[PDB]
Design a protein around this ligand. Structure first.
Ligand code: 6EU
Lengths: 551, 104, 131, 71
């Protein structure tokens, strides 16, 4: 009851700065206002009453409680309409849009650049209860924006990074709203906000068109490039399998199979030349000088290509494993030929080390096939995860027992390294244990060898059952989707061209008139066709088609 | 039935990967060792003996580059243990997620 | 469900009949209140009930879980640490750790007021562990 | 959870102190007034703050709060 007479009193006194537009002053709670409180407390009547007296509906609540990544904070954006949208209050959003005094604007964006659609992207994590809220409020705000301001396209407005809500949902890793936005069908009042159409439906077969406005890799800063090279989430291999993306990447791979085979044969010919030059090193001196020159050129080529990769689209151990191994082999090759040109005589271990490393890098090209590509994915995952803690524990046990046997044996076990070598021979199955008959302390040496053998059998058995428990309690589609993500990164690399000659890339998909716009010229969109077959289509209603007869 | 399905499916890609690793390391040891490892075949035979459990490794004390030979042998042993471990868990991922009526 | 229903009913009835006496303070001859007994004997369901307990308008002081504020979906909930804290002698944490003999000890450490408190102790004691 | 129990035993042992220096232990959590008792003075309890995020809060009934603004 006290609100209306108090505002009448504050208007009667004649202040220069009003009471109803009041901002909190603290650093933790800066810029907060009574309108944010009224929207938080779910009271529509107090919102109407504060609006009619003249509350600022674009008040930017920029406090430290209202920022993104601080602990136990609520990031809704700054504006009141973004708060009303995030807090599931539909009638408050409706009144704030359609009031006669001081209308809230959908184009209005916060200090971080985010509009209300970006905020609805940011709040989503995972549930039915969060996801249904976010998709319903997203669709409702788009339809309300088409009603109130038809010329503005609300999904075009970017953040301060330069991202639209679709690119933001791709980067932050939100699967549910990204999957909703890519395939979105609207009805007869406003159908031009759709991204999915049906071109024709002759019986059970039909042809669905998908829009590729920001999805195609032809335009810079795509969705495909953001999933491949800019997203940091562990959701990245799941987002590649979705409905317009899988067929598009399969089409690009089927276009680019010949260049993959050509790059394979070029690398194989390089490694055979490098093998013959490292074998015949020790007339023929002319052919060996030509061979050394070709190896130096190949090393400079691979080194510059990998440096251009790391400069261009990076800034990350498991994701960039292949590029690291190619970089090490290239640097060791160039360094070894520099030392052979200067004759520093240490060129031969670097030469054979880069030779072995270059032959074992031939498993990069086994990702063209599924049957062996998933196998090399598993080799990466075994080397990076499960081998290193085993080596940690094993080297602790090994050098503890080595120093014990060196110091207890006062010709057997002369030094720490020569005792480590015999204790490592026990692991292979080549090591010798016996009753020495010359040492004074024979029984203790034999007891320590028996204990070492039992402990390392325990360690190997543990490693095996740890891998079995990790693999048997795992989803089958994960290895398949990691392989698909590797192919997607590979096809986006082959599309960009070689480093010495940048390629002129082409659009994908046909250009056709999808409909009429609200104003003037008809809607003209680049679309990608996916054929579909469904046998329950006789029950549901027939959708509107762009064409009549299948072509 | 299981013998045929093990031979045709699992063993051949393992042999592919293993022979790539094997002959890469064999040519490296032949060229690095300037009486040990006299030829490509005679060094491939020793690196294959390491898989049986019969293979001899030592600090050679006559070659100039002893430590690099020892380091390459240690790396070969770890990589082949990784490959056999992978083959085993790949068969277990095929066999755990299968219907029991199918072999019958 | 029987034990939690009758436990709450007895607390409300004793709060009505004899208000000054607190029933949950009276110890056994072993020295234990019912929360320490539920922690010691290994009973997960009633221990989990007592640690997060909310009562209503007639008898509100019998709760052990309070909400300090709720701004939208976020809230800060206040949990009482009367016998849970390791400052006092013969705690619930000491009884779960040492004096319990059940096979259910490791399941009782993961409960909602305990997980955050033990993480907040471990993040403070990291440097002495490295030392 | 077995590993969490191991860290719990470790943090109790480090909190108790060494044998040669019996360390003085400190209370955890803030002390604040929760409400009034049925007899006389208000209740002052030592409490531990746990933050939570819940999107089912709108359909349910709103609980009693001890403070007004999030501070
Ligand atoms: C960067 C890492 C992690 C790495 C660099 C080198 C030292 C490496 O040893 C490891 C660790 C290691 C050490 C000792 C024995 C085995 C493995 O594994 C690779 C790394 C592991 C091997 C095995 O080859 C692979 O990893 C398969 C592979 C290669 C290239 C790829 O692009 C690839 O992608 C699928 C997979 C290659 C080596 O370079 C090699 O052949 C020699 C001489 C040593 C290998 O270190």
């Amino acid at each position: 009851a006290c609100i209306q007479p108090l505002l009448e009193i504050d208007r009667d006194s004649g202040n220069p700065q009003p009471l109803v537009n009041a901002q909190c002053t603290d650093e933790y709670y800066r810029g907060h206002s009574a309108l944010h409180i009224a929207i938080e407390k779910r009271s529509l009547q107090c919102v109407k009453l504060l609006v009619e007296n003249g509350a600022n509906v674009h008040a930017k609540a920029c406090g430290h409680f209202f920022q993104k990544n601080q602990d136990t904070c609520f990031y809704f954006g700054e504006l009141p309409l973004s708060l009303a949208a995030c807090t599931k209050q539909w009638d408050v959003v409706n009144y704030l849009l359609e009031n006669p005094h001081q209308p809230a604007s959908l184009q209005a964006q916060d200090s971080l650049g985010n509009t209300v659609l970006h905020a609805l992207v940011m709040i989503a994590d995972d549930s039915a209860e969060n996801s249904a809220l976010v998709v319903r409020m997203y669709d409702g705000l788009l339809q309300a924006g088409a009603r109130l301001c038809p010329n503005v396209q609300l999904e075009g407005i970017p953040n301060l990074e330069g991202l639209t809500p679709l690119k933001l949902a791709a980067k932050e890793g939100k699967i549910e709203i990204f999957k909703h936005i890519l395939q979105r069908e609207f009805s007869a009042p406003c159908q031009s906000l759709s991204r999915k159409f049906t071109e024709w439906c002759y019986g059970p077969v039909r042809v669905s068109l998908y829009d590729l406005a920001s999805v195609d890799s032809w335009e810079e800063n795509s969705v495909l490039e953001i999933i491949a090279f800019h997203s940091r989430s562990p959701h990245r291999h799941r987002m590649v399998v979705l409905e317009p993306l899988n067929k598009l990447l399969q089409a690009k791979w089927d276009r680019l199979i010949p260049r993959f085979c050509f790059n394979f044969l070029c690398y194989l010919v390089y490694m055979l030349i490098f093998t013959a030059v490292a074998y015949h090193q020790p007339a023929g001196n002319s052919m060996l000088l030509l061979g050394h020159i070709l190896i130096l050129l190949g090393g400079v080529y691979l080194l510059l290509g990998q440096l251009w990769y790391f400069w261009r689209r990076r800034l990350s151990f498991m994701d960039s494993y292949s590029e690291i191994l190619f970089l090490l082999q290239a640097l060791l090759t160039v360094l070894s030929q520099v030392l052979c040109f200067l004759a520093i005589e240490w060129y031969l271990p670097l030469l054979v080390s880069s030779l072995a490393m270059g032959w074992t890098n031939l498993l990069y090209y086994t990702r063209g096939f599924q049957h062996t590509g998933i196998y090399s994915v598993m080799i990466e995952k075994v080397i990076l995860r499960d081998l290193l803690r085993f080596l940690l524990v094993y080297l602790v046990f090994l050098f503890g027992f080595a120093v014990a046997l060196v110091s207890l044996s006062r010709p057997p076990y002369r030094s720490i390294l020569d005792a480590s070598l015999e204790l490592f021979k026990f692991t292979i199955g080549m090591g010798e244990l016996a009753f020495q008959e010359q040492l004074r302390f024979r029984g203790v040496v034999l007891l320590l060898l028996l204990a070492y053998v039992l402990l390392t059998y325990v360690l190997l058995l543990n490693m095996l059952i740890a891998l079995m428990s990790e693999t048997v309690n795992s989803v089958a589609t994960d290895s398949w989707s990691i392989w698909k993500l590797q192919k997607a990164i590979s096809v986006l690399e082959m599309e960009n061209g070689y480093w010495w000659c940048r390629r002129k890339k082409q659009r994908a998909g046909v250009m056709l008139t999808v409909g009429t716009r609200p104003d003037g010229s008809p809607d003209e969109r680049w679309c990608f066709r996916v054929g579909e077959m469904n046998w329950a289509t006789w029950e549901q209603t027939l959708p509107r088609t762009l064409c009549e007869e299948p072509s």
